């Protein structure tokens, strides 16, 4: 029934504090109410401390807040092997102590930031140690993969080609939200050149609320977590769909809010609104899980979608007749009291697997090579319990992820 969550890496923790905020906010549980149902991991104390100093301070147990005073290191190796190792046990312990206390759970919603040290590496083995300790569950990892041109870390790819290959054979469904492609939404669909990280977080903090929160919440067309991976992954590769939200209108500027279904659903497939720089440049969808929430008439959907199924310029895979999982919830969304999110009475958090990422992975793989081609910051990992193996052998890994996402599509 439940779904634990492990927010790993400063980012996964910032986003965590955010997604965790939106929660109580739409459940009437102020600062000090019940008890969360997740944990927080980081090898840099000062960040988890922000959850220990700032807002939502006492809504957590100093037990579900793991820290390694030591060093973060923007390098996979160190975070996965060398350092990150020391903490893992302890980490697990909570996701085994928190996993017990419950009643027939469904899985762990993992929150990490692909291209980091504590986020890429660590998790790599966290999800790793999970796939074995609970192979019998769902492992949906919600990632924030590398901005297409606006990356931060100098190494980023090293850290992301490595978190992909190690987690690939362990996740159930990996959701992806592109940090940059979300900015566009903040520039083009909300207008603000002042987007603090605290915003992107409010956003995913939204799209995510549509996943677990409301879905695990009764409705006219419930959709379990398992449901996802089933209706969402055509193949064992921990396939990565993309998150998209519909009413991303500004709560100040424009106001046409009352944008009946027929509109908000069409607003999902236009590439300028998908929290991912993977513009459907060719990527044929192969399965979409249209999660609606608020006042929505099933016919409105079983029509708004029909209209789409016949737009053709939206070309769905061949081997897939119908790939539209319509998830209907009741309670409308719940916007921050005064952030910058419109606040409509219905939304569409549609996520999907698109042959599109054939790109995004490509462009991120290429990156890697360029540097590896010169070993660049390699000495930083080797000296951290890794080898020419793990790199070269994780490169070959993704290689067959560029072929995979190519074969499962583009061909009939």
């Amino acid at each position: 029934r439940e779904c634990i969550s492990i927010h790993v890496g400063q980012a996964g923790v910032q986003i965590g504090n955010a997604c965790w905020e939106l929660y109580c906010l739409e459940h009437g549980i102020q600062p000090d109410g019940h008890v969360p149902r997740a944990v927080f991991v980081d090898l840099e104390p000062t960040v988890i401390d922000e959850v220990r100093t700032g807002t939502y301070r006492q809504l957590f147990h100093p037990e579900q807040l793991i820290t390694g005073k030591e060093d973060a290191a923007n390098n996979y190796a160190r975070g996965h092997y060398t350092i990150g190792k020391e903490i893992i046990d302890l980490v697990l312990d909570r996701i085994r102590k928190l996993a017990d206390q419950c009643t027939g759970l469904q899985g762990f919603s993992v929150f990490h930031s692909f291209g980091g040290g504590t986020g890429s590496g660590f998790t790599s083995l966290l999800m790793e140690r999970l796939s074995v300790d609970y192979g019998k569950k769902s492992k949906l990892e919600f990632s924030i993969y590398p901005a297409p041109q606006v990356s931060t870390a100098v190494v980023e790819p090293y850290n992301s080609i490595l978190t992909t290959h190690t987690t690939l054979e362990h996740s159930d469904c990996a959701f992806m939200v592109d940090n940059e492609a979300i900015y566009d939404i903040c520039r083009r669909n909300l207008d603000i050149e002042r987007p603090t990280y605290t915003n992107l977080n409010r956003l995913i903090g939204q799209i995510v609320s549509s996943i677990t929160a409301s879905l695990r919440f009764d409705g006219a067309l419930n959709v379990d977590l398992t449901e996802f991976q089933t209706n969402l992954v055509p193949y064992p590769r921990g396939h990565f769909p993309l998150a998209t939200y519909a009413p991303v209108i500004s709560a100040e500027k424009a106001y046409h809010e009352q944008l009946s279904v027929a509109e908000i659903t069409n607003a999902c497939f236009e590439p300028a609104n998908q929290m991912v720089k993977c513009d459907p440049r060719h990527g044929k969808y192969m399965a979409c899980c249209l999660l609606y929430r608020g006042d929505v008439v099933p016919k409105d959907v079983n029509a708004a979608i029909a209209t789409i199924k016949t737009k053709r310029t939206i070309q769905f895979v061949d081997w897939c007749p119908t790939g539209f999982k319509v998830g209907i919830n009741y309670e409308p969304p719940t916007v921050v009291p005064g952030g910058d999110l419109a606040k409509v009475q219905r939304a569409v958090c549609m996520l999907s697997n698109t042959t599109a990422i054939a790109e995004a992975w490509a462009r991120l793989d290429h990156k890697f090579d360029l540097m590896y081609a010169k070993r660049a910051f390699v000495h930083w990992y080797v000296g951290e319990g890794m080898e020419e193996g793990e790199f070269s052998e994780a490169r070959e890994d993704m290689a067959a992820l560029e072929k995979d996402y190519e074969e499962v599509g583009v061909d009939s």
Binding site: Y81, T82, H379, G385
Partner: protein, 320 residues
């Protein structure tokens, strides 16, 4: 003299590996290619289980020995995981004529050139033995010299000054020196049979000659490098002094790979400064003889994993 070459050697399955029933997974091709499920391979030469110690030596070391006796430099690297065949290939049955490896043969050929030239020539054979352990150069011939420095020669090329030089006048003297040094080598024991070495080993054979009548002098350097295998520290679970050992071994192998890759592509810049090992060997890689990297592999399900890694270390051969 002077292209770099890597040579692969597969050992037979021992008494130990047969009951399991591991089927022939390696389907050799030609005399240079080995196919295991992977990427396509190719090396300068691939020696099967049937290939003699004599046949192995002639192809990998014989030309380097001739160059050293002619006054030039040369280097021989031996790489492989535990139970790959390093000991058997490099030393074997040290006193037996058939069973002897690479080192007793080099030493045989050197002393066969010596004596045969006693007419106007005066020979001096100087040996040195050091290990690189925890990024420190430890003399294996003097236990007091645990942290040792380079200085530069007449041309501004570095060399290991203070390295205990031992004068050797026979093939038996060289073997005794190797044995003495081995007893000082940083070894680790998982099981009594296993010999993990947490350190890279460098054995130096310096062949000095003075032509009494011509007054002309030669000094050829032969470097025998024993490489500890790359360690996946996630596996093994190294820690404290082990994890620091594993990182250090891995770093050194990366450095070495970066150096050989640079020299293979005939690049202007060769990153000898990446490790203390590549700097000790700088003069003997640089502008010298036919460096040979001998990589030892195990056949069977025993090691498709570690065998694969052993071949990926060697990825610089002939590129491209």
């Amino acid at each position: 003299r002077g292209n770099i070459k890597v040579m692969c050697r597969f050992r037979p399955l021992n008494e130990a590996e047969i009951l399991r029933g591991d089927k022939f997974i390696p389907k050799f091709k030609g005399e240079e290619t080995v196919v295991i499920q992977g990427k396509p391979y190719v090396f300068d030469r691939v020696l099967p289980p049937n290939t003699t110690q004599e046949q192995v030596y002639n192809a990998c070391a014989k030309q380097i020995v001739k160059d050293v006796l002619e006054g030039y430099n040369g280097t021989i690297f031996a790489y492989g995981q535990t139970s790959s065949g390093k000991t058997h290939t490099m030393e074997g049955k040290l006193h037996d004529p058939q069973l002897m490896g690479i080192i007793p043969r080099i030493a045989h050929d050197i002393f066969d050139h010596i004596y045969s030239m006693d007419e106007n020539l005066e020979f001096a054979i100087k040996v040195s033995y050091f290990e690189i352990y925890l990024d420190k150069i430890r003399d294996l011939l003097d236990v007091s010299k645990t942290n040792l420095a380079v200085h530069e020669d007449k041309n501004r090329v570095p060399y290991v000054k203070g390295c205990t030089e031992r004068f050797v006048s026979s093939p038996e003297e060289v073997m005794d020196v190797i044995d003495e040094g081995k007893s000082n080598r940083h070894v680790a024991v998982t099981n009594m049979n296993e010999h993990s070495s947490r350190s890279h080993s460098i054995f130096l054979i310096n062949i000095k000659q003075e032509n009494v009548e011509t007054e002309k002098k030669l000094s050829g350097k032969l470097y025998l490098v024993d490489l500890a295998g790359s360690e996946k520290v996630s596996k093994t679970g190294a820690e404290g002094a082990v994890l620091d050992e594993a990182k250090n071994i891995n770093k050194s192998l990366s450095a070495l790979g970066n150096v050989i890759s640079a020299l293979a592509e005939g690049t202007t810049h060769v990153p000898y400064r990446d490790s203390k090992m590549t700097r000790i060997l700088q003069d003997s890689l640089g502008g010298n003889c036919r460096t040979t990297i001998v990589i030892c592999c195990s056949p069977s399900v025993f090691n498709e994993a570690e065998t694969k890694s052993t071949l990926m270390f060697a990825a610089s051969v002939n590129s491209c």
